[PDB]
Design a protein around this ligand. Sequence first.
Ligand SMILES: CC[C@@H]1C=C[C@H]2CCN(C(=O)[C@@H]3CC[C@H]4C=C[C@]5(CCCN5C(=O)[C@H](Cc5ccccc5Cl)NC(C)=O)C(=O)N43)[C@@H]2C(=O)N1CC(=O)O
Length: 111
Amino acid sequence: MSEQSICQARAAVMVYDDANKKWVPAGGSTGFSRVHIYHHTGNNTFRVVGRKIQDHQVVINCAIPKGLKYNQATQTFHQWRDARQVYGLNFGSKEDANVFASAMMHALEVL
Ligand SMILES: CC[C@@H]1C=C[C@H]2CCN(C(=O)[C@@H]3CC[C@H]4C=C[C@]5(CCCN5C(=O)[C@H](Cc5ccccc5Cl)NC(C)=O)C(=O)N43)[C@@H]2C(=O)N1CC(=O)O
């Protein structure tokens, strides 16, 4: 397989609607997702890909660039921003937040 999952964590994936200063559910679909970080070993790249638990819709698919600032705002809500959007993960548990942050931080160390 070209891409290998390095973690799976449960979270409600949010994107920030700057115009209304409000978080809104990614993909317009309230509820929780299974959120992976996938590693493409060929070029050592990483992306966050999350799918709704119910209907499998992909609600996030974003690259993790070198130098990203991953903000652990709370024990259960982490966020980061790129050139177009601000993403937030409202984790199902502190354990899920810890798993995801570990993998993210690993990725950011090896990029
Ligand atoms: C899904 C509900 C949600 C859950 C939990 C809480 C936790 C706190 N919180 C926030 O939205 C916080 C409070 C202040 C506000 C102000 C601005 C925001 C919003 C937009 C981005 N931002 C930044 O602070 C970024 C972070 C950053 C730093 C460094 C690198 C990257 C980033 Cl992204 N700052 C820049 C300058 O990039 C922000 O997160 N905000 C969440 C929240 O209240 N709710 C409840 C609701 O919304 O009802």
